[PDB]
Structure 1
Amino acid sequence: AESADLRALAKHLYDSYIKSFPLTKAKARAILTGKTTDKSPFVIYDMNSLMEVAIRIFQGCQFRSVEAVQEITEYAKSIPGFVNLDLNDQVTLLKYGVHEIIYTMLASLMNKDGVLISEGQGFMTREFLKSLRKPFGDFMEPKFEFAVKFNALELDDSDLAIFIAVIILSGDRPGLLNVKPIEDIQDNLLQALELQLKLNHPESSQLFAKLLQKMTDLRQIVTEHVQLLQVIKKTETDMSLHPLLQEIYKDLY
């Protein structure tokens, strides 16, 4: 494809990304740093400040997850070629890509000490999350570890918009009916991402490779997360998970 096409594609994705996601990375980091006058997020460091504690956080993350799925689903439909895909594959691509994207974007809201929550109105410390009882205290730590390494790449919303699209158009998801169309689209997205990184990050070496590498880390983070939910289901008789997440998780990986 001509560079003009790839640039047009990069801009298209960035624009629909801005429309699909309320809190961008630019805003979040501005907040985390405090270079914006609106309201410094409330800091939740323990039980008193938060006002079972594990259940509330459980509900909090669950509610945010459901919103993200819908947001990601809307963004996917704006990717050239996606809606022209067999409906079944669209569902499959979303089924397996949403959590990888959720954790990718969760990184934009974290730093070595915490994570913005509730539209960026709150800031839950890492320490606090690691202190939750039973298996509840080891859910976020894996994400924080990932976040730190991922954020070191210093990607901006324009970089992320394409990366997320690349994750969605993965032709290796179990159950796909027509792999070729999906791979052709990802190919165009990959080239656009490569050009984007070269122009946006001229002094950063092998950034394209390091970013693609992160796609395998996301696989691990997702499987490890499912397993922890397996534990909870086992050690918490009253599991109960939102029906949408149940659907996405039914026979996942």
Structure 2
Amino acid sequence: SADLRALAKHLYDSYIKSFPLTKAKARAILTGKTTDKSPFVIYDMNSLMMGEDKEVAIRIFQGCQFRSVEAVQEITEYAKSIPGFVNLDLNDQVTLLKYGVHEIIYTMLASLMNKDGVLISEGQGFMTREFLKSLRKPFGMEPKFEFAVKFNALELDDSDLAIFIAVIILSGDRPGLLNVKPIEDIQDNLLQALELQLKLNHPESSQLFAKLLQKMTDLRQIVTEHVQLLQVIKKTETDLHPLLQEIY
């Protein structure tokens, strides 16, 4: 039990060290807290180009593409610090990440979100949900917002997210994995540690562990729909990053 707690601290340390915008910073920026600075708000085309100070719809997709890329670099950096990940068969490390990064992006994306919009550029900016929903065509972050709303109601902090994200990466159901068993061995560990952490950090909360695993369903749905859209865009525009091209 003391070992699981120690494993939780490790993941947390590494999470802090791998992701410069945490959920705690992001919430401070959103709630006008004096620990951090207020963002500029992008709510329309006028304030959009007013906010680039700092086609529009194409410019914002490419922007999301560039931010996704950095996300992958940071998530990759984080995976290397999960005990046993770097000991795994190389082809599988690549496999696990290739299929997990999207799921993690949306998880941490919820960290940047409220029912009214999302933080961007390390909290410097705040693009509104309506402005995005009105962006066209095609430009329709709306399901990401609905998951965010549901997701953020669990009220997990960064030390929760750190373990949960580790679990996601270590998914032995990932397609085309050579050796499944060691990955599962690691995930079982992460899982058991997530169980204890949620039981210690949210004691009044019931079945939060179960509730937190169920959300992995929602994540699959989101990512499938995302990939479909991106494939349609790829055939309606002739002219992705070498990392972006790799995952897709």
Normalising by structure 1, we get a TM-score of: 0.93
Paired residues for 1:84-99 under 5 Å: 84-99=87-102
1:131-173 C-alpha deviation (Å, 9 max, x unpaired)? 0112213xx0010011000001000000000000000000000
- The answer to which of 28-37 and 184-193 deviates more is 28-37
RMSD between aligned residues = 1.1
Which digits, 9 at most, give the CA deviation of each residue in 1:165-203, with x for residues without a partner? 000000000111111100011001000000000100011
* CA deviations over 1:93-141 (Å, ceiling 9, x no partner): 010011100110000000000000011000000000000112213xx00
Counting matched residue pairs gives: 242
Q: Is the deviation greater in 85-94 or in 28-37?
A: 28-37
Q: Secondary structure at the match of 1:84?
A: coil
Gaps (5+ residues) in structure 1? none
Residue pair 2:43, 2:128 contacting (<8 A) in 1 also: yes
- Kindly provide the CA deviation profile for residues 36-94 of structure 1, in whole angstroms up to 9, marking residues without a partner as x: 254310000111111x1111111211111110101000100000011110011100001
**1:76 pairs with one of 76, 79, 100:** 79
- Per-residue CA distance 1:199-244 (angstroms, 9 max, x = gap): 0001111100110011111111101001111221233333xx2221
Q: Distance in 2 between matches of 1:125 and 1:7?
A: 38
Contact 1:109 1:115 in 2 (8 A): yes
Q: Is the 8 A contact 2:11 2:81 kept in 1?
A: yes
Tell whether the 8 Å contact from 2:29 to 2:36 is kept in structure 1 after alignment.
Answer: no
Taking the aligned partners of 2:20 and 2:35, their CA distance within structure 1 comes to: 18
Residue number in structure 2 paired with 1:175: 176
**Structure 2: segments with no counterpart, 5+ residues:** 49-54
- Pick closer, same or farther for the CA change 1:45–1:215 going to 2, 3 Å: same
Distance in 1 of aligned mates of 2:174 and 2:150:
25
Q: Is the 8 A contact 1:44 1:124 kept in 2?
A: yes
Q: Using a 3 Å threshold, how does the CA distance of structure 1 residues 201 and 62 change in structure 2: closer, same or farther? A: same
Distance 1:37 1:203, change over 3 A: closer
Q: Percent identity?
A: 100
**8 Å Cα contact 1:135/1:231 also seen in 2:** no
Q: What's the secondary structure of 2:119's corresponding residue?
A: strand
Instruction: Name the residue aligned to 2:47.
Output: 49
* Alpha-carbon contact 1:40-1:121 (below 8 Å) kept: yes
**Structure 1 CA distance, aligned partners of 2:126 and 2:232?**
27
Partners of 2:25 and 2:36 within 8 A in 1: no
- Structure 2 counterpart SS, 1:166: helix
- What is the alpha-carbon distance in structure 1 between the residues aligned to residue 121 and residue 87 of structure 2? 34
Contact 1:10–1:158 under 8 Å retained in 2: yes
Counterpart of 2:62 in structure 1 is 59
Tell me how far apart the structure 2 counterparts of residues 44 and 158 of structure 1 sit (CA, whole Å): 30
CA distance in 2, matches of 1:86, 1:192: 24
Query: TM-score if structure 2 supplies the norm length?
Result: 0.95
CA contact (8 A) 2:24 2:157 kept: yes
The alignment partner of 1:135 has SS state of coil
* Structure 1 residue matching 2:126: 3-state secondary structure: strand
Would the aligned equivalents of 2:16 and 2:22 in 1 still touch at CA under 8 Å? yes
